[PDB]
Amino acid sequence: GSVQIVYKPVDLSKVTSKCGSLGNIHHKPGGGQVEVKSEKLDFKDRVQSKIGSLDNITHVPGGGNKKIETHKLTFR
Amino acid sequence: GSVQIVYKPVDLSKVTSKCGSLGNIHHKPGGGQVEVKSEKLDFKDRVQSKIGSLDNITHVPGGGNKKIETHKLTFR
Amino acid sequence: GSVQIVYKPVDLSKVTSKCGSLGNIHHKPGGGQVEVKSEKLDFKDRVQSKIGSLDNITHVPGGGNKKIETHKLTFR
Amino acid sequence: GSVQIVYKPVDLSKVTSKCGSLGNIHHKPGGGQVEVKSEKLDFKDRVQSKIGSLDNITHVPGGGNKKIETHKLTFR
Amino acid sequence: GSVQIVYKPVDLSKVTSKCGSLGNIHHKPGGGQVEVKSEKLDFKDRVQSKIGSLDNITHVPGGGNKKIETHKLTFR
Amino acid sequence: GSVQIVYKPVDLSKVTSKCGSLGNIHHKPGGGQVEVKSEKLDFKDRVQSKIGSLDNITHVPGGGNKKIETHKLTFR
C-alpha cells in the first residue's frame, strides 16, 4: 500500500533584545600556572572534557536569550 | 504502492537586537604558564577536549541571542 | 509503484542588529609561556581538541546573534 | 695636657660551614595580583618599608651563619 | 699639649664554606600583575622602600655566611 | 704642640669557598604585566626605592659569603 509524508513545519517565532549603553567592562586576571601529566586516555562517543584548566571568563551579552528545540518523529 | 514525499518547511522567524554605545572594554591578563606531558590519547567520535589550558575570555556581544533547532523525521 | 518527491522549502527569516558607537576596546596580554611534550595521539572522527593553550580572546560583536537549524527527513 | 689614642683591635674570628649535596629545590608560584593607590608619603630617617607587596622567597643557604658586632667608644 | 694617634687594627679573620654538588634548582613563576597609582612621595635620609612589588626570589648559596662589624671610636 | 698620626692597619683575613658540580639550574618565568602612574617624587639622600616591580631572581653562588667591616676613628 501507498506511503505519504507531508513535512510542512512553520516557524514564525522571535528571539529579541533591547539594551542601553553596554560597557565599562574590565577583565584583568593575575596570571597563574598549570601542569598536567597525562597517559592512556580513550574518549569514544560525544565526550566533552577538560583536564588541568585554569580558565577566566567574563561573558556579558546585551541579550543572551536561548531557544533550543527538538521535534523528532520516528516511524518503523 | 506509490511513495509521495512533500517537504515544504516555512521559516519566517527572527533573531534581533538593539544596543546603545557598546564599548569601554579592557582585557589585560597577567601572563601565566603551562606545561603538559601527554601520551597515548585515543579520541574516536565527536569528542570535545582541552588539556592544560590557561585561557582568558572577554565576550561582550550587543545581542548574543541563540535559536538552535532540530526537526527530524525518520521512516523505515 | 511511482516515487514522487516535492522539495520546496521556504525561508523568509531574518537575523538582525542595531548598535551605537561600537568602540574603545583595549586588549593587552602580559606574555606567558607554554611547553608541551606529546606522543601517540589518535583522533579519528570529528574530534575537537587543544593541548597546552594559553589563549586570550576579546570578542565584542555589535550583534553576535546566531540561528542554527537542521531540517532532516530520512526514508528507507 | 697631651692626648694619646692607641686603636689596635685584633680579629682572629671565623664564620664557617660544611654542607653535602645542596639541591633538588623547586620554586613555582601561581602568579597573583596587586593594586596600590598611594598619596603623600614622607619617610625621613632610616625607614624600611613596603606597601602592597605579594612577594615569594625560597632562601636555602648551605651555611647561612651571621656574626654582627658593634664596638662603640665615645669620649666627651 | 701633644696629640698622638696609633691606628693599627689587625685582621686575620676568615669566612669560609665547603659544599657538595650544588644544583637541580628550578624557578618557574606563573606571571602575575601589578598596578600602582602614586603621588607626592618625599624620601629624605637613608630610606629603603618598595611599592606594589610581586617579586619571586630563589636564593641558594653554597655558603651564604655573613660577618658584619663596626669598630667606632669618637673623641671630642 | 705636635700632632702625630700612625695609620698602619694590617689585613691578612680571607673569604673562601669550595663547591662541587655547580649546575642544572632552570629559570623560566611566565611573563606578567605592570603599569605605574607616578607624580611628584622627591628622593633626597641615599634612598633605595622601587615602584611597580614584578621581579624574578635565581641566585645560586658556589660561595655567597660576605665580610663587611667599618673601622672608624673620629677626632675633634
Kindly determine whether residue B12 and residue A12, on different chains, have CB atoms separated by under 8 Å: yes
CA distances from B43 to B52, C39, C49 (A): 17, 14, 9
Q: How far is D53 from chain B (nearest CA, A)?
A: 16
Query: Are E18 and F62 in contact, with CB atoms under 8 Å apart?
Result: no
CA distances from C68 to B70, C14, C65, D52 (A): 9, 12, 10, 50
Q: Among all chains, which residue has been given the C-alpha cell 522539495?
A: C7
Using CA atoms, how far apart are residues A27 and A45, in angstroms rounded to an integer? 35
Among chain B residues, the shortest Cα distance to D32 is held by B30
Among chain B residues, the shortest Cα distance to C68 is held by B68
Q: How far is F76 from chain D (nearest CA, A)?
A: 10
Cα-Cα-Cα-Cα dihedral sign, residues F2, E76, F44, D35: positive
The reported resolution of this PDB entry, expressed in Å, is 3.0
Using CA atoms, how far apart are residues D72 and E74, in angstroms rounded to an integer? 8
Using CA atoms, how far apart are residues C9 and A39, in angstroms rounded to an integer? 49
Return the DSSP state at F37.
E
Beta strand C14-18 with B14-18: parallel, antiparallel or unpaired? parallel
Query: Are E68 and D66 in contact, with CB atoms under 8 Å apart?
Result: yes
Closest CA to D14 of E69, F68, F17, F14: F14
Q: Among all chains, which residue has been given the C-alpha cell 589518535?
A: C42
**Which grid cell is D65?**
651563619
Helix (H) or strand (E) holding B30: none
Show residues of chain C in contact with E33, CB under 8 Å. 30
Among chain C residues, the shortest Cα distance to B57 is held by C57
Residues within 8 A of E (CB atoms), D 41-70 only = 41-70
Q: Among all chains, which residue has been given the C-alpha cell 522567524?
A: B13
Closest CA to A72 of A7, A2, A4, A3: A7
Q: How was this one solved?
A: cryo-EM
For chain C, give the longest Cα–Cα distance. Answer: 71
Gaps in chain B (C to N distance exceeding 2.5 A) after: none
Query: Are E63 and E17 in contact, with CB atoms under 8 Å apart?
Result: yes
